[PDB]
Amino acid sequence: MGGEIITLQAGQCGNHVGKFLWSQLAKEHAIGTDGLSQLPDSSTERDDDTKPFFRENSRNKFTPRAIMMDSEPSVIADVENTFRGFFDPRNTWVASDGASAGNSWANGYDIGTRNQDDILNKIDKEIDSTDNFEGFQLLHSVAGGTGSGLGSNLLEALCDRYPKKILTTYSVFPARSSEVVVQSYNTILALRRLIEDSDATVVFDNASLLNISGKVFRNPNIDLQHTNQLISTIISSVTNSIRFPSYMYSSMSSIYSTLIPSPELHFLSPSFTPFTSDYIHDDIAHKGHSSYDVMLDLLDPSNSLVSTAMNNPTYFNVYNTIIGNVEPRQISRAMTKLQQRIKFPSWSSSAMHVNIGRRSPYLPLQPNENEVSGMMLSNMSTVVNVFENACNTFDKVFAKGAFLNNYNVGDLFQSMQNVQDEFAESREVVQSLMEDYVAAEQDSY
Amino acid sequence: MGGEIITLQAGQCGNHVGKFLWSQLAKEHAIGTDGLSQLPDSSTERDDDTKPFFRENSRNKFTPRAIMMDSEPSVIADVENTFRGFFDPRNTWVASDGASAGNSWANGYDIGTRNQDDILNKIDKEIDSTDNFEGFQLLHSVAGGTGSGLGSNLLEALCDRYPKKILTTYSVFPARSSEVVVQSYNTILALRRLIEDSDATVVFDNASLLNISGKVFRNPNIDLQHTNQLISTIISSVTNSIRFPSYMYSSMSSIYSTLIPSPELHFLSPSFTPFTSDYIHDDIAHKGHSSYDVMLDLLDPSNSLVSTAMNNPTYFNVYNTIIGNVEPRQISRAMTKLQQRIKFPSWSSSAMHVNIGRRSPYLPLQPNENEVSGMMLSNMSTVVNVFENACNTFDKVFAKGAFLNNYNVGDLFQSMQNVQDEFAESREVVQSLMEDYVAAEQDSY
């Protein structure tokens, strides 16, 4: 409905994906770069938005309901841009020492703990402003100092504070062709929080992701902004069915039921086609529905490391396809109906026939070639691989002793490494259970 | 027609003939030299010459589907003249390294490799914008460095990437008394690639082409530019029945299949009279239909060298005559039937009589001074003599150790002297095959 969602932007990564997101929304809902209300333009019949994600000022300036947390560089970059109106200084909460682009989970955890009140004050204002609160979204990286450590501190406080409200995360998991080995410390400490304190993690695995930014966008040199533009296109597309009326995928309850199939398996992998959507650097992106969709099933175009389809599980627990048209609705409609009936995944006792569609209109108000797009959000057994590679990485760094110094400064490691062990035991139980879904032994009655 | 042809121009000569070619087609349909949209028949389609060679970009004016490639001199000349409206800025490419080819195949070849991605981005755009591309036509000379080395390089990629798309070439082969000494080297090294990597090659022997241009169309100071005027008349005419409505059920591929029996017997010979058709030189002629037809079989008039007299022991495999005249259908038809029967082009048992004729009338808005004129395309097994000459001349220059200098800087001729030798052996195999086509022993029973 119009119910509010409060957006939490954490670390370098969150602020960078977030700025692009509001820009992209803005073109779409026909409003200026500072969020000013345009009167003959429509944004309240074409969309619900300009109240779910935005709020109105007394001088009639819409601003996104977002709370920005991180250090100084990123808050300073946005105001220098014209995208300044999407942010406000009161929304900005700024540290000066929880910084690091690289992995330094502890440093971040600890700073959050010092300034618990200053943040909780920000959070309380945003909740007090809500009319009907749906829930929270955290945008971050679990590869930052700032995005990683602090973001996971905040999830534990939000879990405790509210148990029946949705917590969704778009979490960037640290790449495994990286040049740092502290990646393991961040991934393990965060991953505990990400399963329990949050109800959904949409995994973006940077190794695959970075290559998608490299090949398609054709960047001349790679930077944080670049990769983060790729993430803003996928993120905007996932929300399309919410934002448009005449679809019952707008209510809070109905999104949660469809998407989350166990309170323990709720690890999501994205695929999107075409990836460009308002940042086209490519000769063409205009294509029939069939190419896009057939490609959406494929594990080859994916932003997370779900690897290829050979020597890997093919067992999909759920599949959700989110549909965008600006070409005949009937051809696409008929096709979705056929796709569910055909059953691309394998299926056993546990579940069967789990293919769902959400239908949305795509808007050409974005720079496009009059392309049709779609997004896949899927819950797949192949996702266990990612955790596995982390387990292997964690052991090697344990042995070496490399750069424990920052970590001990943090609360978790001065309170022994018993917590980590406890987590390891729980986590393996989660992977074994996900493997079982593959077979016919999960449902046996 | 609705079957598109994409034109490739390589070298000094390829861009020159190309600019002049486009000026000709523009003049013929009563439009501008920048390409303005001002067809008198857009309301019933008696113009279809504004679509197998031109594309619409919605800039209110048609532009030819052409990509121009070389060094700096030719591209500066095209831009300087008002035929610059046929070329978007992306269509003009300047890219030279080691400071032009310098009349060296090995340098020329090497320049294409570095900026390989740049060329492909142009090829991929042009194919994707097209409704349905039949295949490619290359305009270039095998006499330079650039025309040869880059033209060959582009042919090898095209064959490999797309094996199901036809590559027809218009290759200008140099003079056989030689105008530049190093031409013979370029011709061998390019001709090897031309043979394997091309599906069809139309041989234009420059020696012959030049003599005709000086004698028949006068003008003090023949140069490249006069001689290219003759070539632009030829290129226009070979497509004539497809681009005009007279036929439209013919296609590029079926014309190619019938003329070309095997990919090591794909050498076509032209003959032409008056040697313009659609005037853009000077001199008008009128000579009877019987006389006009008789002259076409004859190999003394013709824009390539091959042994004199009709009826050869290295027989005509197949003959295509493209008739252009505004006189009744009945005379042309009665004459193509007669021509096959009389045996002016030799024919054999165990290969059948294969003589086809295509008929066209010339545009009503092309200068009215017309006559019975035609172009001949035949695949005749006497072509071999041009190739042999250039090989004999090549080995003599090489033996002296003169003029080896230019090549040596490029890696390909410095290492791989194998190629020249390869072609000589390759030419003997081809000869053997041409000979079997006469007899029943062209495949074993």
| Domain boundaries, given as residue ranges, for chain B | 3-268, 269-380, 381-444
Coil, strand or helix: which one is B268? strand
Q: Write out chain B residues lying below 8 Å of A283, CB-based.
A: 121, 124-125, 128
Between CA A300 and CA B13 the distance in angstroms is 45
Mutate to test the interface with B, among A215, A216, A280, A284 (most CBs of B within 10 A): A284
Question: CB-based contact (8 Å) between B333 and chain A?
Answer: no
B120, closest residue in chain A (CA to CA): A283
User: Minimal CA–CA distance to A54: which of A68, A46, A66, A45?
Assistant: A66
What residues in A contact B125, CB-CB < 8 Å?
A: 283-284
Is residue B130 within 8 Å of B436, Cβ to Cβ? no
Which residues sit opposite A36 in a β-bridge?
A61
Residue of A nearest to B130 (CA): A284
**Rounded to 5°, angle at Cα A267 from A263 and A269:** 150
A79 touches chain B (CB under 8 A): no
**Residue A291 touches partner B, C-beta closer than 8 Å:** no
- Which residues are CB-neighbours of B111 under 8 A, at least 6 positions away? B95, B96, B97, B98, B101, B146, B149, B150
Query: Would you list the DSSP string of B74-137?
Result: HHHHHHHSSTTTT--GGGEEE--SSSS--S-HHHHHHHHHHTHHHHHHHHHHHHHHSS-EEEEE
**AA letter at B429:** V
Distance CA A181, CA A163 (A): 34
Encoded tokens for B5: 């042809």
| Token pair 């309850």: residue | A253
List chain A residues with CB under 8 Å of B123: none
* Cα–Cα distances in angstroms (integers) from residue B39 to residues B1, B25, B48, B178, in the given order: 16, 12, 10, 44
Distances in Å between the Cα of B74 and the Cα atoms of A280, A397, B85, B411 are 33, 62, 16, 26
Q: Are A268 and A200 in contact (CB under 8 A)?
A: yes
Let me know: does B325 contact B290? Beta carbons within 8 Å: no
CB B170 within 8 A of CB B202: yes
CA distance B126 to chain A (A): 9
Tell me whether residue A146 is annotated as binding. yes
Kindly report the backbone phi and psi dihedral angles of residue B375, in degrees, each rounded to the nearest multiple of 5, phi listed first: -125, 150
Residues at the binding site of B are: 143-149
Query: Residue A371 corresponds to which amino acid?
Result: E
User: What are the structure tokens assigned to A437, written together?
Assistant: 């879904």
Q: Say whether residue B117 is in contact with chain A using an 8 A CB cutoff.
A: no
Chain A residue numbers with beta carbons less than 8 Å from the beta carbon of B129 are: 284
> Which residue of chain A comes nearest to B129, CA vs CA?
A284
Closest CA to B232 of B209, B260, B249: B209
Task: Look at residues B56, B41, B144, B95 and name the one whose alpha carbon lies nearest to residue B365.
Answer: B41
Report how far residue B132's alpha carbon sits from residue B52's, in angstroms, rounded to the nearest whole number: 10
Residue whose tokens read 């996971």: A152
Residue with tokens 């139980």: A429
Coil, helix or strand at residue B269: strand
Nearest residue of B to residue A286, measured between CA atoms: B128
Does B121 lie at the interface with A, CB-CB under 8 angstroms? yes
Query: What residues of B form the annotated binding site for GTP?
Result: 143-149
Question: Which value, to the nearest 10 degrees, does the dihedral of the CA atoms of residues A422, A427, A429, A433 take?
Answer: 160
Q: Is B2 helix (H, G, I), strand (E, B) or coil?
A: coil
Residues in chain B with CB shorter than 8 Å from the CB of A216 are none
CA distance B237 to A71: 71
Taking the CA of residue A280 and the nearest CA in chain B, the distance in Å comes to: 14
Six-digit token pair at A411? 């609360």
Q: What angle do CA B82, B88, B94 make, to 5 degrees?
A: 95
Beta bridge partners of B277: none
A-chain residues near B124 (CB < 8 A): 283
Closest-CA distance of chain B to residue A213, Å = 18
CB contact under 8 A, A284 and B121: no
In angstroms, the separation between the Cα of residue A286 and the nearest Cα of chain B is 10
Using an 8 Å CB-CB cutoff, list chain B residues near A284.
Answer: 125, 128-129
Compute the radius of gyration of chain B from its Cα atoms: 21
Q: Do A284 and B125 touch (CB under 8 A)?
A: yes
Q: Nearest-CA residue of chain B relative to A285?
A: B128
- Shortest alpha-carbon distance between residue A355 and chain B (Å): 33
Q: Does B131 touch chain A (CB under 8 A)?
A: no
Q: State this model's resolution in angstroms.
A: 8.0
Asked if B158 contacts B28 with a C-beta cutoff of 8 angstroms, the reply is no
- In Å, how far is A219's CA from the nearest CA of chain B? 14
**The token pair that represents A312 in the structure block:** 């890997």
Q: Which of residues 212-251 of A touch B (CB under 8 A)?
A: none
CB-based contact A284 B129, cutoff 8 Å: yes
Q: Which residue has the tokens 């390829």?
A: B14
Contacts of A173 (CB under 8 A, 6+ apart): A142, A143, A187, A203, A204, A205, A206, A304, A386
Phi-psi region of B55 (alpha: psi -120 to 50; beta: other; left: phi over 0): beta
Cβ contact B165:B197 at 8 Å: no
**By CA distance, what is A369's nearest residue in B?**
B129
B124 touches chain A (CB under 8 A): yes
Q: Residue B180 belongs to what H/E stretch?
A: none
Token digits for B418? Answer: 């194998």
Query: 3-class secondary structure for chain A?
Result: CCCEEEEEEEHHHHHHHHHHHHHHHHHHCCCCCCCECCCCCCCCCCCCCCCCCEECCCCCECEECEEEEECHHHHHHHHHCCHHHHCCCCCEEECCCCCCCCCCHHHHHHHHHHCHHHHHHHHHHHHHHCCCEEEEEEEEECCCCHHHHHHHHHHHHHHHHCCCCEEEEEEEECCCCCCCCCHHHHHHHHHHHHHHCCCEEEEEEHHHHHHHHHHCCCCCCCCHHHHHHHHHHHHHHHCHHHHCCCCCCCCHHHHHHHHCCCCCCCEEEEEEECCCCCCCCCCCCCCCHHHHHHHHHCCCCCCCCCCCCCCCCCCEEEEEEEEEECCCHHHHHHHHHHHHHHCCCCCCCCCCCCCEEEEEECCCCCCCCCCCEEEEEEEEHHHHHHHHHHHHHHHHHHHHCCCCHHHHHCCCCCCCCHHHHHHHHHHHHHHHHHHHCCCCCCCCC
Chain A residues close to B118, C-beta within 8 Å: none
Beta strand B373-380 pairing with B316-324:
antiparallel
The token pair at B423 is 């072609």
Paired with A238 in beta bridges are none
DSSP-derived secondary structure letter, B170 = E
**Rounded distance between C-alpha atoms, residue A50 and residue A54, angstroms:** 5
Find the distance separating the first CA and the last CA of chain A, reported in whole Å.
39
Residues B122, B93 contacting (CB under 8 angstroms)? yes
Contact B170, B13 (CB under 8 A): no
Pairs across A and B, CB distance < 8 A: 7
Question: Do residues A108 and A145 make contact, with C-beta atoms less than 8 angstroms apart?
Answer: yes
Pairing label, strands B316-324, B267-273 = unpaired
Q: Using a CB–CB cutoff of 8 Å, tell me whether A284 touches chain B.
A: yes
Sheet holding A267-273, edge to edge: A92-94, A66-70, A4-10, A133-141, A166-173, A200-205, A267-273, A373-380, A316-325, A356-361
Residue A297, both tokens: 């099933």
C-alpha B254: how far from chain center? 17
Nearest CA distance, B118 vs chain A (angstrom) = 12
Q: Are strands A66-70 and A63-64 parallel, antiparallel or unpaired?
A: unpaired
CB atoms within 10 A of CB A325: 18
How many angstroms separate the CA of residue B125 from the nearest CA in chain A? 6
> Would you call B125 an interface residue with chain A, using a CB distance cutoff of 8 Å?
yes
Residues in chain A: 445
Asked if B107 contacts B409 with a C-beta cutoff of 8 angstroms, the reply is yes
A112 belongs to an annotated ligand binding site:
no
Strand partners, B173: B205
Q: DSSP character for B46?
A: S
- Rounded to 5 degrees, φ, ψ at A8 are -115, 130
3-state class of B397 per DSSP? helix
Is residue A381 within 8 A of residue A438, CB to CB? The reply is: yes
**Three-state secondary-structure class, residue B182:** coil
CB proximity A283 to B under 8 Å: yes
Task: Indicate the residue type of B356.
Answer: I
B118 and A CB contact within 8 Å: no
Residue A11, annotated ligand binder?
Answer: no
Within a 10 A sphere around the Cβ of B183, how many other Cβ atoms?
27
The length of chain B is 445
> Quick check: A30 and A365 in contact, CB under 8 A?
yes
Cβ of B36: how many Cβ atoms within 10 Å? 13
What is the three-class DSSP state of B22? helix
Q: Where are the alpha helices (DSSP H) in B260-378?
A: 289-297, 329-342
Distance from CA of B224 to the nearest CA of A (A): 36
* Per-residue CA distances from B117 to A382, B46, B122, B124, B295 (Å): 35, 39, 9, 10, 48
Phi, psi of A291 (to 5 degrees): -60, -45
Any residues with CB less than 8 A from the CB of A124 and at least 6 apart, and which?
none
Lateral strand order in the sheet of B316-324 = B92-94, B66-70, B4-10, B133-141, B166-173, B200-205, B267-273, B373-380, B316-324, B355-360
Nearest Cα residue to B172 out of B150, B185, B187:
B187
The answer to whether A424 is annotated as binding is no
User: Among B118, B127, B128, B131, which would you mutate to test the A interface (most chain A Cβ atoms within 10 Å of its Cβ)?
Assistant: B128
